[PDB]
């Protein structure tokens, strides 16, 4: 019931943290590329597409985490 | 009828949400730099960074306080 | 009995992962600002930045992996 739903919620939040870690690593890559130029456009197109896909996945996982949060709260009410 | 562990507010998911706002701000910042390197609004970006950074650290601190209360309730039997 | 314990134990590692990812975020913000002040010695400082990224990335992957291990234990307990 409630503990089951909590465990299922943790799975989605953990996937979101993992996907956000990937997004972080992509931002680290972009910062490093620009720093090496200070001190191609196809590669940046690939960077943009990886950002888009992981951002889209994260928003999906957040939304499903939000949906499970409401199910859990309604599960707790009334019991 | 239940333990407070299973009812407390999910500030962890709130932190995940706010960290995604920060990530998307850093993506925007990187994209602007990229457009000039390869060839005001930045105060607004700085402000938004600071606001979400302040929010996230508040959620982390509250999540840590919940964690301490969760552990103590486990110990209370 | 043990499921509630495992749920609490996982929350600790997931919160630690979120904290470590926040420090990674702050490091990327630092790098973005350094490049922005340039547009609109330092080699050692950037190596120090690179070293902090690596240390926090390694910590995050460790906390994620152990959060996943506890997720599996929790799911198996439910089964």
Residue numbers in the entry:
A (entry chain B): 543 to 581, 624 to 663
B (entry chain C): 544 to 582, 626 to 663
C (entry chain A): 542 to 581, 623 to 661
Sentences from the paper on this structure:
Entry of human immunodeficiency virus type 1 (HIV-1) into target cells involves fusion of viral and cellular membranes, a process mediated by the viral surface protein Env (gp160). In the Golgi apparatus, each protomer is cleaved into two subunits that remain noncovalently associated: an N-terminal surface protein (denoted SU or gp120) and a C-terminal transmembrane protein (denoted TM or gp41). Ultimately, the extended state collapses into its most stable form, a trimer-of-hairpins (TOH), in which the C-HR regions pack in an antiparallel manner into hydrophobic grooves on the outside of the N-HR coiled coil. The thermostable core of the gp41 TOH consists of the three-stranded N-HR coiled coil surrounded by three helical C-HR segments.
Propagating HIV-1 (NL4-3 strain) in the presence of fusion inhibitor C37-KYI led to the selection of the escape mutation Q552R. To determine the structural impact of this mutation, we crystallized a construct composed of 40 residues from the N-HR sequence (N40) and 37 residues from the C-HR sequence (C37) and solved its structure. Although the mutant six-helix bundle crystallized in a hexagonal space group (P31), three-fold crystallographic symmetry did not run through the center of the N-HR coiled coil as it does in almost all previous gp41 TOH structures. Instead, the structure was markedly asymmetric in that only two of the three N40 segments were folded into α-helices throughout their entire length. The N-terminal region (residues 545–554) of the third N40 segment assumed a distorted, largely extended conformation. However, by residue 555 (three residues C-terminal to the Q552R mutation), this N40 segment resumed a helical fold, restoring three-fold symmetry to the coiled coil. As a consequence of the asymmetric distortion of the N-HR coiled coil, the three Arg552 residues occupied distinctly different chemical environments. One Arg552 side chain extended from an intact N-HR helix into the coiled-coil interior, where it formed a hydrogen bond with the backbone of the other intact N-HR helix. The Arg552 side chain from the second intact N-HR helix reached into an N40/C37 interface, replacing the Gln551 side chain from an adjacent N-HR segment. Thus, in contrast to the wild type N-HR coiled coil, the Q552R-mutant coiled coil possessed dissimilar C37 binding sites, with the distorted N-HR segment substantially disrupting two out of the three sites.
